[PDB]
C-alpha cells in the first residue's frame, strides 16, 4: 500500500532523463532498496517496456544502451535471482494458510477475508492480473459496502502504480457508482483524492480544481501521495482555471493550504507564482513560469503529459488580465511589466491573436497595443450566435432522420 506510490513516482523520473541528474540518481537508489524489501522486481520489468532504444535505459537483463544518461537503472541478475527466491516462498506459505481458513465455517467474514489477503500480496508486488482475479471473489462474497469501496480503490491504485491512465479510468467509474450505494462518509474522502488526481491526469482541470481544494480539508494518507504533492496540485490547477478575483478568494478562503507552508522544491515554485498573478505585478511571473515547469510538471506523473499545454495556456492568461484593465498599452511599458523584451513578446502574442482567443491588435508603427475585446453587449452577441447556429443544426438532423424511417 504505502511504498507503492513512492516507488512509482521515483521510477517515473528514471523513465525520463530530462530530470536533474542528482534527482535521477537518488531516485534510482530508493527504488533499488525497495526491490529487496517489498519485491518491486516484477515492476522493474515494466520500465524497459516504455523504452526500447529510447533513453533512460542501461539494463542488463535487456539491451544496455550507453548512449543514454541513466546508468543506475541496472537490472542486475542479483535482483532477478532474488525475485524468483522470494516469489516462490511467499506463494507456498500463504497458500497453505488460506486453504485451511476457507475450510473453517463462515463465508461472511472468514472466506471473504482469506481471499482479500491474496489480492494484497499480488497488489503489493505489482502483478495486476493475479490481484484482479482473486479480489473478484472477495467482492462477490457477502461483505459490507465499505469493504467493496476499499478493494476498488486498491485495484485502482495499481493503475496509478503502472502509471497507465487507461486502467485507472474504468475502475474509478466503478467506485463512482458504488459510493452512492454505500452511503459511507469514511471512504468518501478517499474517493475525492483519487478522483482529483484523475481529472488532473486528463485535461479537465475545472473538475480537478474543485477536488484538489477539498483534499486540503480532508486528506487520507492510506494509498495516496504526499500532503505536499496534493498541495502542489491544488495550486497548479487553481492558476489554470481561476483568474485574479476568483483565485485570490480561493487561497484566502483556504487556510489549510497556508498551514503547510512551502517545504519542498516543487511546492515553492508554484506557491510563489500564485502571489504574482493576483497581486497584479507580473514582474516575477516570467522567471517563475520557467521554475514551475522545471520542478512541477516534468517530475510529476500526472502533469508531464500536460507540461507543454500548461505554459501555452498560462501565457495567454497573464497577458489577458493586463489587457483587460488597460484600453491601451505601450509595448515598452508592457515589456517592462513582465520582465521580457519587446520583440520576444510579439512572438508569443502572434500565436494567441489569430485563434482570437485573446482579442488584441498591435500597432507596430505607434508601438501601442490596442485592445479590441468587446466589453459591451457586442460580447454577449458573440456568445449567443454560435450556440444558436448549433441549435438550428441539431434539430435539422434529428427531425429529418425520423421522417425518413
Amino acid at each position: 500500500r504505502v511504498p507503492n506510490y513512492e516507488v512509482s513516482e521515483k521510477a517515473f523520473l528514471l523513465t525520463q532523463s530530462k530530470v536533474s541528474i542528482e534527482q535521477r540518481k537518488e531516485a534510482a537508489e530508493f527504488v533499488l532498496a525497495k526491490i529487496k524489501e517489498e519485491e518491486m522486481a516484477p515492476y522493474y520489468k515494466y520500465l524497459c517496456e516504455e523504452y526500447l532504444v529510447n533513453n533512460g535505459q542501461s539494463d542488463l537483463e535487456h539491451d544496455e544502451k550507453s548512449d543514454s544518461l541513466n546508468e543506475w537503472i541496472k537490472f542486475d541478475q542479483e535482483l532477478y535471482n532474488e525475485l524468483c527466491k522470494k516469489n516462490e516462498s511467499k506463494i507456498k506459505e500463504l497458500n497453505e494458510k488460506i486453504q485451511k481458513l476457507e475450510e473453517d465455517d463462515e463465508g461472511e467474514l472468514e472466506q471473504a477475508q482469506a481471499w482479500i489477503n491474496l489480492g494484497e500480496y499480488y497488489a503489493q508486488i505489482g502483478d495486476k492480473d493475479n490481484a484482479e482475479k482473486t479480489l473478484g471473489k472477495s467482492l462477490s462474497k457477502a461483505i459490507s459496502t465499505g469493504a467493496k469501496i476499499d478493494v476498488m480503490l486498491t485495484i485502482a491504485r495499481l493503475g496509478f502504480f503502472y502509471n497507465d491512465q487507461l486502467y485507472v479510468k474504468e475502475k474509478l467509474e466503478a467506485v463512482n457508482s458504488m459510493i452512492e450505494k454505500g452511503g459511507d462518509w469514511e471512504r468518501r474522502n478517499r474517493y475525492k483524492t483519487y478522483y482529483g488526481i484523475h481529472c488532473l491526469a486528463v485535461r479537465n482541470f475545472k473538475e480537478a480544481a474543485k477536488l484538489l481544494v477539498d483534499s486540503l480539508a480532508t486528506f487520507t494518507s492510506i494509498e495516496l501521495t504526499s500532503y505536499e504533492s496534493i498541495a502542489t496540485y491544488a495550486s497548479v490547477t487553481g492558476l489554470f482555471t481561476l483568474e485574479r478575483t476568483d483565485l485570490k478568494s480561493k487561497v484566502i478562503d483556504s487556510p489549510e493550504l497556508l498551514s503547510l507552508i512551502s517545504t519542498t522544491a516543487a511546492l515553492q515554485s508554484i506557491s510563489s507564482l500564485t502571489i504574482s498573478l493576483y497581486a497584479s505585478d507580473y514582474a516575477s511571473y516570467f522567471p517563475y513560469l520557467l521554475e514551475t515547469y522545471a520542478n512541477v510538471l516534468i517530475p510529476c506523473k500526472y502533469l508531464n503529459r500536460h507540461a507543454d499545454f500548461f505554459v501555452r495556456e498560462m501565457r495567454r492568461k497573464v497577458y489577458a488580465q493586463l489587457l483587460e484593465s488597460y484600453k491601451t498599452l505601450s509595448l515598452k511599458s508592457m515589456a517592462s511589466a513582465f520582465g521580457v523584451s519587446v520583440a520576444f513578446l510579439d512572438n508569443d502574442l502572434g500565436k494567441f491573436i489569430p485563434n482570437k482567443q485573446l482579442n488584441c491588435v498591435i500597432d507596430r508603427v505607434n508601438g501601442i497595443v490596442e485592445t479590441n475585446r468587446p466589453d459591451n453587449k457586442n460580447a454577449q452577441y458573440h456568445l449567443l450566435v454560435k450556440q444558436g447556429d448549433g441549435l438550428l443544426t441539431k434539430l435539422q438532423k434529428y427531425g429529418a432522420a425520423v421522417r425518413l424511417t
Binding site: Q165, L290, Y293, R305, A307, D308, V340, N355, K397
Partner: protein, 89 residues
C-alpha cells in the same frame, strides 16, 4: 470507425435488412473501403501518426498543439539574455 462525433451518427442510423444492400453499393461505387488499400499503397505502416500524443490514439483531449515543441527552452533563453542587457545597462 465513425465520421464526426462517433455517438452522434451511431444513434442517428442503424442497420436494416432493407438498407443493407444499398450501403454496400455506396462503398463499392468509390471503389474500396479506403482504409486497407492505403497501407499497401504506400508500402509502409504508421509512424507519422506518432507525430503527437493525441494523434496516435485519442485517449486524452485536444490541446490545439500541432508540433508539440517544448516552449521552456525558448522562454529560458529569453529570460537570462534579457537580464544581462539590463545588467550591462
Amino acid at each position: 470507425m465513425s465520421t464526426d462525433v462517433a455517438a452522434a451518427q451511431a444513434q442517428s442510423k442503424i442497420d436494416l435488412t432493407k438498407k443493407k444492400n444499398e450501403e454496400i453499393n455506396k462503398k463499392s461505387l468509390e471503389e474500396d473501403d479506403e482504409f486497407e488499400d492505403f497501407p499497401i499503397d504506400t508500402w509502409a505502416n504508421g509512424e507519422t501518426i506518432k507525430s503527437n500524443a493525441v494523434t496516435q490514439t485519442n485517449i486524452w483531449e485536444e490541446n490545439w498543439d500541432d508540433v508539440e515543441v517544448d516552449d521552456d527552452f525558448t522562454n529560458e533563453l529569453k529570460a537570462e539574455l534579457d537580464r544581462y542587457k539590463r545588467e550591462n545597462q
